[PDB]
């Protein structure tokens, strides 16, 4: 029953980051998750100290609700088109062990097949910009919903154009018609310093997609916590949690 969990694609500078954190803490949010877009052309890996939130923010974000300390997550969104770049991401399962939730973005149907079949990821990114048609096979979706794969739908087409709005709503209606709507969570991107709307109306932005009259909000509020759970069971251990506790 953990609400207020979305995925943000936002890094420009510290000032815009502080503004987005203050805006999210003001409106309705209690967990901020920052994505980092990495494409297949650059192939860069800077994982050790790239962001450093706690050394630069001031000790607490204050919200209007229960006034609880906001947990801040650092996630990685990897755009993967080539199959060799997917093999590079296969090589990163033992070399560098950070970035609690690993989010792959597929473009090839064979690569999307082996992503749901063999490749150990947390949440598959599905965004459609500038004419990307894609078919859906149902038994890997069944293995995905049996495993725990929550499908990410990162949306921000309303700010730039309207054709991008059309392709996103068409791909989302196709996803809701084929995937049947078991675990699909939607999230907003942040390039401009104000690209966030109300938290209760994200439920209707998912209800325009479909998925239920109420289990859209119930499914995002359950499956984002289940996504943090899946990332934690990938990070710590698959059945064990070992934490150093020195009182």
């Amino acid at each position: 029953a953990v609400f207020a969990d979305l995925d943000l694609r936002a890094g420009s500078d510290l000032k815009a980051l502080r503004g987005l954190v203050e805006t999210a803490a003001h409106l309705g949010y209690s967990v901020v998750a920052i994505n980092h877009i990495v494409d297949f052309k650059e192939k860069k890996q800077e994982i050790e100290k790239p962001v450093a939130v706690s050394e630069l923010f001031t000790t607490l974000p204050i919200v209007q609700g229960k006034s609880r300390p906001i947990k801040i997550l650092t996630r990685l969104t990897i755009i993967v088109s080539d199959p060799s770049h997917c093999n590079v991401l296969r090589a990163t399962s033992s070399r560098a062990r950070l970035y609690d939730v690993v989010a792959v973005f597929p473009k090839t149907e064979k690569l999307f097949h082996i992503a749901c079949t063999h490749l150990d990821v947390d949440l598959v990114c599905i965004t459609v910009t500038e004419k990307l048609p894609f078919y859906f096979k149902r038994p890997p979706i069944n293995v995905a919903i049996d495993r725990g794969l929550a499908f990410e739908l990162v949306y921000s087409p309303a700010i730039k154009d309207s054709t991008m709005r059309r392709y996103t709503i068409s791909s989302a209606l196709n996803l809701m018609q084929i995937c049947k709507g078991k675990n699909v969570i939607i999230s907003s991107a942040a390039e401009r310093p104000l690209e966030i709307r109300g938290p209760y109306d994200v439920a209707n932005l998912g209800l325009l997609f479909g998925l239920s009259e109420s289990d859209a909000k119930a499914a995002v509020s359950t499956n984002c916590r289940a996504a943090l759970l899946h990332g934690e069971t990938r990070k710590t251990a698959f059945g064990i949690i070992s934490t150093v506790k020195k009182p």
């Binding site: 309303a158 709005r165 401009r192 109306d201 209707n204 932005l205």
Partner: protein, 121 residues
């Protein structure tokens, strides 16, 4: 003289829905008007969802200038379409406006008293 007892139970007699929204304009160029807000509400649903769905029976209550707050009503048909139209951020001139909804009710009393904070200290 008349004194008696009678139990009457209704099913969905509400037929209306009200929205209290506080406006958060980004730029300092606040050239608001009562007619221009209505024109923006018409032009948003037209390009976003439809001109047929833009002329839904809607009106504005307690339109406040400095406080930047208003109440919009639509009947029980296009409330979802109104929420999504105000979600997808239809603009007017090129200064992009953030439209953030405070509260929605089917009642003008539970909305008018308080629902959001319920104590502000």
């Amino acid at each position: 003289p008349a004194a008696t007892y009678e139990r009457v139970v209704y099913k969905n007699p509400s037929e209306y829905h009200y929205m209290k929204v506080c406006l958060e304009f980004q730029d300092c160029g606040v050239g608001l008007n009562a007619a221009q807000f209505k024109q923006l509400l018409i032009s948003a649903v037209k390009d976003l969802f439809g001109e047929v769905d833009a002329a839904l029976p809607l009106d504005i209550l307690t339109y406040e200038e400095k406080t930047l707050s208003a109440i919009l009503r639509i009947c029980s048909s296009g409330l979802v379409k109104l929420w999504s139209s105000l979600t997808l951020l239809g603009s007017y001139k090129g200064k992009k406006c953030a439209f953030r909804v405070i509260q929605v009710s089917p009642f003008l009393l539970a909305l008018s008293g308080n629902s959001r904070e319920l104590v502000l200290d």
